[PDB]
Structures are given as structure tokens and as C-alpha cells.
Design goal:
Two copies of one chain form a homodimer. Chain A is an alpha/beta fold. Chain A has nine helices and twelve strands. In chain A, β11 and β12 form a beta hairpin. It is classed as chaperone.
Chain lengths: 287, 286
């Protein structure tokens, strides 16, 4: 049956005392298909020059308060679905990690039976297995005349790890702000934003509005169904509020939010509509 | 029995070694048979700085990935010898990420190796960040007498093309400290050539994992699921170093303050070697 499935974290045997999410939690929070009913702007951008820069998770394991480790990565749906909208529209994509190490997907959440998500994933495998070093990106491919229109930070739980305290992410968010480019992020992806307020008395993103994954669900429901095998040592939305950001949501409804050029999503549910929002906004800003 | 690589379900198109290759290359116990200098250094100042791997997957020529890490035998057995002589160990990585081991080679029944793992589990799970160590804990008055780079196939990623590892190897030379590495660990020494016509380790002699074994036998028994994209011995040779072996016999070498071992078989004999050299250096004050 489909609620006799275990609520116990399954162990990941590549690592010591580290665990996948429970078969139950996977039965409620994943699915073979996503809620995607096609693209709005197939072929809209033609000139070829504009593209999206993705910053990505390269570390899979998140050490928790009980000493156990959660075996995560970026959420495939939250990465791959928005990118499908963009790529079909005619925006190319480059993939960077902090170190140039391979990108870590939460593969236990791959919608296996979705033509769009799997075909997009195939088109990105190379750039995923062999990303760019983001410091190499700042050095060359940014500046005022950069062909990056926006910087996309997908979610998953792994987005909490390196991405949250990185001077190279800070420098990238400084660039985006100072050249009116989009920052697109969703889920725990917003933990990236904590890097903007590093070595500083106040953040450049103070008074910005974002959808964030609610603390409640990480501190409460996710632990009780064995999605996470222990408590996180701090919470994305809590520290984002202490940096002077307006965390608009507190529930997981698929709500998206534009605010200046920081377009967000609250959860994995918002993947498809954050994809649609960003394509609209990007094509709008070309005028 | 099977030479077919075993799949790893953490990662797309990734594979552990084949259960046959595990039967030949891995064992529940190591040939450890005693420390040689327990309690020898008592003054508790001098420590050892390990630089470990954060990346466990190695992308290969066929597109498949190899699920590795540092070799627990090569990491832990040498650190046991040095810890029991009285040198504490501080673990660093490049981005501060958790240290990745090849847990399929962890000698489960070996008391000394397991004991050492538990003593470091905390420092292994939250290592220091190598660039912070550079900023704060190096210089001429640093309490690191050696820097230790264990092998495992994951030493090939990151470490081998890292300005932080480069600065670290510069320090050791310019401050007369030891560089102790084994197996595929010497791939770290390729960083000394980074952005330089000439490497400061030009001319040094080292033991490395033979090219022959990674190209032929490791592929045939399904240790590796595909061919490595470059070879550590070949690239090292090109930087002007002198690769002194072409086989795995457990050999070791000491060229000045650079101590190398050729394989996981040298783990014990090298640990022995590193403790003697370090104690001998301390005696060379008066």
C-alpha cells in the first residue's frame, strides 16, 4: 500500500551516517510527472546573445544537529523546469559551481516520466557534469557588457551549504544589482542571498520581498515524516529576516513573487510558474 | 564474483568498484603491526595538516563517473603512527566541505584504523577551509611541521589545479616543512606548476600509482568503470618531476623533505617513515 511505506530515513551507502528521504516522504513530495502544460514564448528571443547564468550546488551532504547527514542536492524540478521555459524561448544557459566540481541533483526527486524535464536534463548533462568555476566567471564573463541577463539559483536543500557564505556569490549578486539584471531563485535557493550581507553591517538586499521555504515545515513536518533525518542548525527564512528582508510567505502553496528584479518561488510547486514569470520579465526588459 | 561495476544511486551514471575487484584490492584488516614511537613527542606544539578531498565523483572518458574519495587505509594508517607519537592532526579541505572517503575500502575489522577514524570523525565532517588556514595558521612560526595529502582517486579532482594547495606547497618549501603524500595524492604536486613555466618541485623524485595499472588492470576487473582522462604519473613527469616506479610494490621514497609512497600497500611503511623524519627534525634543534 501507499501509506505502509516506511517513515524511516533510507541510508545512502556512499557516505558515513547519511540518509536519503524516507519512501513515505518521497510518496508525498515527489511525482513521476510535473504540472507542466507547455511553454508561453517558444522562439520569442532570436538575436542569440542573451543568456542565463546558473549558480549551483556541488556539495550534497548537509550536517544536522544530531550529527546525521542529509543526502540532498539541487531539486531537479526547481532547476530543470524553469530552464526549459527559458531555453525554449531562445535563451542559452551556462552552469557554474563554486569550485568547478560536478553539480549534485537530488536524483530521488527526478520526475522520470516527463518528456520536457528529462529532455532538458539531457541537453544540460555535459554542463552539469563539468561546470564552470564561478571565480573564472567573475574574472571574464561579467562586467557591465555581460551577456548574462540573469543569475538563476535553484533550490533543493543543498543550496544552504556553500552558496550561503561565499564571497564569489556576493560579488555576483553585487554585479546583478549594480547592472539591473535579474536574480531568479526558489525554495531554499534564497540562502544564496545571505552571501550579499557578508563582512558587512547591513545587506544590499534590505527591504526586498521574497518567497522562501517556510521554517515551520523544516522544523516540524519534514522531520516527522522522515524527509530530513534531523534538525537543521539554522533556518533560511529566519536569518533572511535578520538581514532585513521581508519574508512574505509562511506556507507551501506554489506562490511566486516579483520585486524589482528579484523573482522568487516558495517551494517546488512554484517551479512551472516561476519559469513563466522569468521568461515574461526577461522578454519585457528587452524593449 | 562479478567484474561489472556496481551502481551508486546517489548520482547519475556513477559506479562503485565491482564486487570482484573489491575481493582482490580490499581486505578487512591491514598489515599494521605496531607503532614505533608512542609518546615520543610530548611538548604538544607541532601538528600535521591534512588536505583532503571534498569531491567523490571523477568524470571519465566514457562519460561514466567513478565513486571514490580518499583511501581510508592511506589516510588513517599513517595518521595513527603520527598521532601516537604525539602529533595532533588538523583536517583542511578546499571549500570547507565534508571530507569524502572511499568507504568501500574501509578495513572494518582493523582496530587501529577504525580507532583513528572515530578520533577524527568530527574534524572530518567539519573540516577547516584551506584558504583560512593560509590566511591565519601558516607563515614561518606555524605549528605545522608536515602537510599530509593522502591518495585515493579523488585526489585527482580540485586539489590538482588549486592556487590554495599551491600556496600551501610554496610555504612548506620556503619554511623547510615536510610534504607527505601517497598513491594518487601526488596529483596535488601538479598545483605547484600552476601559472608557472617551472615548478619549484622540478627535479624532485616521487612514487606514484603506475599508469599501467590505471590504464589496464583496474579497467579489466571493473575497479574503474572507464578510462581516466589524464594520468597522474604522465602529467607529473611533464612538470619535470622524476617518477621512480612503474609498478605497485608498496615502495616509498624520501627526496629531501618530500616523502612519497607508491600505493595503498605503502601506507604503513610510510607512516613509519614520516614519524622518523619528523622526530629526527626535532632532534636537529641543538
Amino acid at each position: 500500500d501507499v501509506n505502509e511505506l516506511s517513515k524511516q530515513p533510507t541510508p545512502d551507502k556512499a557516505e558515513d551516517n547519511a540518509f536519503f528521504p524516507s519512501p513515505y516522504s518521497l510518496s508525498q513530495y515527489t511525482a513521476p510527472k510535473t504540472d507542466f502544460d507547455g511553454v508561453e514564448h517558444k522562439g520569442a528571443y532570436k538575436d542569440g546573445k542573451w543568456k542565463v547564468l546558473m549558480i549551483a550546488a556541488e556539495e550534497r551532504y548537509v550536517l544536522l544537529e544530531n550529527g546525521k547527514m542529509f543526502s540532498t542536492g539541487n531539486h531537479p524540478v526547481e532547476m530543470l523546469l524553469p530552464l526549459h521555459h527559458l531555453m525554449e524561448a531562445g535563451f542559452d544557459v551556462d552552469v557554474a559551481t563554486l569550485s568547478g566540481y560536478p553539480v549534485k541533483l537530488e536524483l530521488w526527486a527526478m520526475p522520470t516520466e516527463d518528456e520536457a524535464v528529462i529532455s532538458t536534463y539531457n541537453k544540460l548533462k555535459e554542463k552539469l557534469k563539468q561546470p564552470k568555476k564561478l571565480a573564472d566567471v567573475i574574472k571574464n564573463e561579467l562586467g557591465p557588457d555581460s551577456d548574462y541577463l540573469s543569475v538563476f539559483i535553484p533550490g533543493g536543500h543543498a543550496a544552504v551549504v556553500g552558496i550561503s557564505e561565499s564571497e564569489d556569490v556576493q560579488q555576483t549578486l553585487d554585479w546583478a544589482l549594480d547592472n539591473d539584471r535579474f536574480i531568479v531563485t526558489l525554495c531554499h535557493g534564497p540562502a544564496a542571498l545571505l552571501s550579499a550581507g557578508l563582512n558587512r553591517e547591513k545587506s544590499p538586499l534590505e527591504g526586498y520581498s521574497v518567497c522562501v521555504f517556510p521554517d515551520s515545515l523544516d522544523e516540524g513536518a519534514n522531520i516527522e515524516i522522515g524527509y530530513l533525518p534531523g534538525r537543521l542548525k539554522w533556518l533560511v527564512a529566519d536569518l533572511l529576516t535578520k538581514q532585513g528582508l521581508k519574508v512574505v510567505n509562511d506556507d507551501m502553496t506554489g506562490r511566486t513573487l516579483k520585486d524589482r528584479k528579484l523573482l522568487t518561488g516558495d517551494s517546488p510547486l512554484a517551479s512551472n510558474e516561476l519559469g513563466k514569470l522569468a521568461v515574461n520579465e526577461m522578454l519585457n526588459a528587452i524593449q
